[PDB]
């Protein structure tokens, strides 16, 4: 039933030509950037719960029922395996404990569970500082513990997938671990997926009589998605922005289907791959100096497919062109100004989004939504001023009393200026961004001084905020500056048909009309 084609196996499939292309280098760099940023955000999110868990294990270590701490994690286990790995990293760094991770696949029976537990503890101590798994008795674990650490490390036993266990196997495991307490200091962290009522319902009297569990709560998955979207994919310093259709489709997959951050990262990775694998013309998309080096590197097929992108067409239509449409070298000389135009437009887009998100999400009823992501998808899908919801927002903002209105504009002013100092200032090509945005902010500040010293002037201040921030710095994607296709990824149809899977729909269209596919 199976055939082997072994070719030199003992005891990066692409060659040098593809890796030496600029797009693989820039794609690997941008992907490494996004991946390291997501890992940094997850560690800064987990550090508090990590400190609480380490304080519980060390406090049990300072001092029969086994102490045990349930960790009420989310529906989807695999995101939290890295969290448990960080717990093992901290417990090894402090010399406070050693960890065995009992997956549900290892415990079909009590025997296999005891063998993988003892084997994981012994090899875990071997890797902090190969006998057969058949002889890893609990008595040998006791003799090895007396041989070592009596001269105290806790023996933490993570059970990440608590619901996937057989109930009788779990109860037998709890009784075996409780029988050896006193001699072996056990902490039994768990990874419950439902609620504490599932734990109390699957565990009867005799197993829960010897449990002194304490509940900890990991942060919510939508809270993690909102933090990741506000601090990584909407960061000004990254030049690759998603389109609003792709953004809404990925957030729709996360909020409406599965609470996996990893599936959202893989869908964004497939989006980044379909963007970057069209050629070196998509290798133009990064930071300004290496981009100028890329323009000095460019060949000709990239020039033809940078002529081929749809947003290039209004730029030529609004116009010399002979030297643009066929002379190549004049377009190579022309490229840095257009690239500087796109990067400046997206930085102004982020600062105007920060201002408008404060000014609209503080409002009651919120027609335009609260978070930056919802405003972001709405202003990129379509023009924001023409929406009826923005008209309702303008009505409720001119309806306000003067005091709450000046307080809201002053909060938006201090928020946008603090964002310009703390976040825009370190980036290169950022001095031009504050030089463009700040005089308009000063004009709005003079309008604030006019409405403090003086009802109708509140309408003049709203008109100035509309025509000086929303109108010029928050345009629709059709009105985006040219070759923004280098920076956005709007093709959601192919990513949707390659990620979302509907075998029954494909079988249905294959059994109704073959002519749709075969073209008979």
């Amino acid at each position: 039933g199976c055939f082997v084609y072994k070719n030199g196996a003992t005891r990066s499939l692409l060659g040098k030509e593809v890796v030496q292309q600029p797009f693989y280098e820039e794609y690997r760099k941008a992907w490494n950037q996004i991946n390291d940023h997501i890992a940094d955000l997850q560690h800064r999110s987990y550090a508090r719960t990590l400190e609480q868990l380490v304080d519980f294990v060390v406090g049990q270590a300072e001092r029969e029922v086994l102490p045990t701490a349930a960790l009420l994690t989310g529906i989807n286990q695999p995101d939290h395996l890295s969290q448990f790995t960080a717990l093992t990293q901290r417990l090894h760094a402090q010399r406070a404990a050693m960890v065995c991770v009992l997956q549900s696949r290892d415990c079909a029976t009590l025997k296999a569970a005891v063998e993988t537990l003892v084997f994981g503890l012994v090899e875990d101590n071997a890797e902090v500082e190969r006998l057969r798994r058949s002889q890893c008795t609990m008595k040998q674990l006791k003799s090895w513990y007396t041989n070592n650490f009596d001269s105290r490390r806790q023996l933490v036993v993570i059970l990440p997938d608590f619901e996937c266990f057989n109930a009788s196997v779990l109860q037998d495991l709890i009784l075996i671990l409780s029988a050896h307490c006193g001699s072996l200091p056990f902490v039994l962290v768990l990874g419950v997926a439902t609620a504490m009522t599932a734990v109390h319902g699957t565990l009867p009297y005799h197993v829960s009589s010897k449990i002194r569990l304490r509940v900890f709560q990991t942060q919510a998955a939508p809270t993690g998605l909102n933090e990741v979207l506000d601090k990584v994919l909407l960061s000004p310093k990254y030049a690759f922005h998603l389109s609003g259709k792709t953004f809404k489709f990925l957030t729709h997959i996360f909020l409406y289907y599965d609470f996996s951050i990893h599936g959202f990262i893989q869908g964004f990775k497939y989006c980044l791959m379909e963007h970057f694998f069209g050629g070196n013309a998509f290798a133009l998309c990064t930071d300004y100096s290496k981009a100028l080096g890329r323009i000095k590197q460019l060949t000709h097929e990239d020039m033809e497919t940078i002529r081929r992108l749809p947003s290039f067409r209004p730029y030529v239509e609004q116009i010399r062109i002979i030297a643009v449409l066929t002379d190549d070298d004049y377009l190579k000389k022309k490229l840095p100004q257009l690239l500087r135009d796109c990067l400046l437009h997206f930085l102004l887009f982020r600062c105007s989004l920060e201002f408008l998100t404060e000014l609209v999400g503080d409002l009651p009823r919120c027609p335009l939504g609260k978070l930056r992501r919802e405003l972001y998808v709405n202003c990129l899908n379509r023009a924001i001023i023409s929406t009826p919801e923005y008209k309702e927002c303008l009505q409720m903002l001119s309806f306000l009393s003067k005091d709450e209105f000046v307080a809201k504009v002053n909060r938006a002013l201090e928020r946008t200026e603090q964002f310009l100092v703390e976040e825009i200032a370190p980036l290169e090509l950022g001095e031009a961004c504050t030089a463009v945005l700040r005089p308009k902010l000063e004009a709005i500040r003079l309008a604030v001084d006019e409405v403090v010293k003086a009802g109708r002037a509140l309408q003049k201040t709203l008109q100035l905020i509309e025509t000086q921030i929303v109108q010029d710095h928050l345009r629709a994607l059709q009105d985006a500056p040219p070759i923004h296709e280098l920076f956005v990824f709007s093709d959601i149809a192919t990513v949707r048909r390659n990620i979302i899977g509907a075998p029954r729909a494909a079988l249905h269209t294959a059994l109704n009309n073959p002519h749709f596919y075969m073209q008979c």
Binding site: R307, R308, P310, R313, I319, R320, I321, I322, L325, T326
Partner: peptide, 17 residues
């Protein structure tokens, strides 16, 4: 419209500009 007919008409308007 196709990109090719647009590029061809633009190249003709370009040599004519």
């Amino acid at each position: 419209e196709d990109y090719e007919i647009w590029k061809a008409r633009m190249l003709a308007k370009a040599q004519a500009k």
